[PDB]
Amino acid sequence: AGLYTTYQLLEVQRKLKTLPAFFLQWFPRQINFQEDMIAFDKVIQDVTRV
């Protein structure tokens, strides 16, 4: 002691909360498009008929 107390430092405890990516395992493909919109075209063809 005296004027002040002599300290030793130890290693700094760190915690770093991330968020693991669970739902992105079903989205594998990627589109990098410079147009405005993206259009799909879905078709259902019934064949089962006597």
Partner 1 sequence: RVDFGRDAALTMTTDWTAAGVTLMDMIADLRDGQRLVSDKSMSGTVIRDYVFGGDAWDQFVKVGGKELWGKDGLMDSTIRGSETNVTRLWDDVEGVQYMGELVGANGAGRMRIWVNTQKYRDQNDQEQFLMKQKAVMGISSAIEGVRCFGAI
Partner 2 sequence: TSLPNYLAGNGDLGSWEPTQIFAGEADIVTEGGAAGADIEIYQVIAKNAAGAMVPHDPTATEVPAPQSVAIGIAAQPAKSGQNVPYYIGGVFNHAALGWHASLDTLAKRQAVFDRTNIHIGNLY
Chain residues binding partner 1 by CB under 8 A are: 10, 13-15, 20, 22
Shortest separation between residue 2's beta carbon and partner 1, angstroms: 15
Nearer to partner 1, 12 or 50 (CB): 12
Distances (CA, A) of 22 to 19, 27, 33, 44: 9, 10, 25, 32
Is 2 among the residues that bind partner 2 (CB under 8 A)?
yes
Residue with tokens 């915690």: 15
What is the rounded distance in angstroms from the CA atom of residue 18 to the CA atom of residue 2?
44
Contact residues: partner 2, CB under 8 A? 2-4
